[PDB]
Amino acid sequence: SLLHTFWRLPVAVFFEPHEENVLRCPERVLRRLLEDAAVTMRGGD
Amino acid sequence: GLFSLDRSYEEVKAAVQQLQTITFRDATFTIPDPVIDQHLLIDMKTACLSMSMVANLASELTMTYVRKLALEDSSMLLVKCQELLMRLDRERVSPDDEIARLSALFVMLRQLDDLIREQVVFTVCDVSPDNKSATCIFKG
Amino acid sequence: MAAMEANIFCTFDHKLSIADVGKLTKLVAAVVPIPQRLHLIKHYQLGLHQFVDHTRGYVRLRGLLRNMTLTLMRRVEGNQILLHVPTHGLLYTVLNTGPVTWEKGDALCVLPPLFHGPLARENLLTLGQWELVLPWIVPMPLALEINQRLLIMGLFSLDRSYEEVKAAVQQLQTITFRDATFTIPDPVIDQHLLIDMKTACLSMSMVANLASELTMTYVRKLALEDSSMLLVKCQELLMRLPARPQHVSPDDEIARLSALFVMLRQLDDLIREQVVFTVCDVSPDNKSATCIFKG
């Protein structure tokens, strides 16, 4: 589950979303997306 | 001069001899060894000691301030400096003492300025076939 | 376009008493900085007073003075002042305004004033709450000491307790140079010192990374067979911990030292101050000297 990383230390972010991509999302949002997709997928001899 | 203590071994002697012989355009010559009678003169000894002291002091002093300052960093460079120091370390105090060590670092840094930098005095624009002489503008 | 003027005339629009003019006459051949060059200027732009600000920091004032252009004062008339812009390499007579003692052959730097003695010297042209504040001309060792003290205070301020920071600032701010005592006013720590601290940290990191094992081990090896006051006072600063060199490679050593010189220059530059004058003469009362201008 845990990812391996090349850089030993993390760095702060000083750029807007229109120039570099960053994966950021709260845990609650992740759980909500998971359950919503779970119901959606099923919703779709 | 830095190899002065290790002169016993043949490899060090070979390195010293290679260092002595220098070649510039169409000219080859050898520079004298600053070690005489198996000993180093006091001025070159002071220079080498100053270089080594600056290195040693910086090595231990740097990390403490780097880790404090890099958290604030807005240029993502100081974190890289911290990581470089961590790699270097993995390959291997009273405030008065800290003040003394910082002041000593800077005073040993000042001792090297004669070796560290040098200034141009002439820039040449003419040369005779007699090349022993040339015309040049003076800079000071 | 309009070529830069070498002679600048300054006129006070405030009315001058005979005492004010008498004070002005004493200042001939001193160095006064100005922000911009015109044939005829007003006295407000003259001197360092315009930059005195609520920020009060010594570092920012040092930064501001570095960017002003320096002029020498030619002879005075009624309500007029004539200033001359020196040229590199020529010979000039300059006035020792400050209390610092000069010596033959040393190099002079321009620096914001720092208070000394009773702190009652400030009679210089107070008129309409404008004041004639002039920078100090000091020899290189004192400027190096001042910059070194400022940077050391900045570096030490990090993560140290507030009270011991106060104690360190108290002990560091005072300087004894050439048998005189000076003290740095308003040693504020702010962004201007922060950028210098960042560059110093970067340069020290690179110096520690670059230095070869031979360089690191020289001091340790020397102590095994030498003994001197210099060495014993030298090794007290270090952390307490036959053989042959593990790796000999003169080409690598040469390249490594070549890079290390650049890094040492980077570290040196932030305490170095540009030499403006080099002196070879002195009035035996130390009030004036003849110098070569450079920069």
Curated annotation (Swiss-Prot), chain A:
Chain segments carrying region Interaction with major capsid protein/MCP: 1-44
Compartment(s): Virion; Host nucleus
Quaternary organization: Heterodimerizes with CVC1. Interacts with major capsid protein/MCP and triplex capsid protein 1/TRX1 at the pentamer vertices. Interacts with the large tegument protein/LTP.
Function: Capsid vertex-specific component that plays a role during viral DNA encapsidation, assuring correct genome cleavage and presumably stabilizing capsids that contain full-length viral genomes. Participates in the interaction between the capsid and the tegument through interaction with the large tegument protein/LTP.
Family note: Belongs to the herpesviridae CVC2 protein family.
Protein name: Capsid vertex component 2
Species for this entry: Human cytomegalovirus (strain AD169)
Gene name of the encoded protein: CVC2
Section covered of the full-length record: 2 to 54 of 642
From Swiss-Prot, chain B:
Signal peptide: none
Compartments where located: Virion; Host nucleus
Source domain of life: Viruses
Family designation: Belongs to the herpesviridae TRX2 protein family.
Its biological purpose: Structural component of the T=16 icosahedral capsid. The capsid is composed of pentamers and hexamers of major capsid protein/MCP, which are linked together by heterotrimers called triplexes. These triplexes are formed by a single molecule of triplex protein 1/TRX1 and two copies of triplex protein 2/TRX2. Additionally, TRX1 is required for efficient transport of TRX2 to the nucleus, which is the site of capsid assembly.
Record text on subunit structure and interactions: Interacts with TRX1 and major capisd protein/MCP.
The protein's name: Triplex capsid protein 2
Entire-sequence positions represented here: 154 to 306 of 306
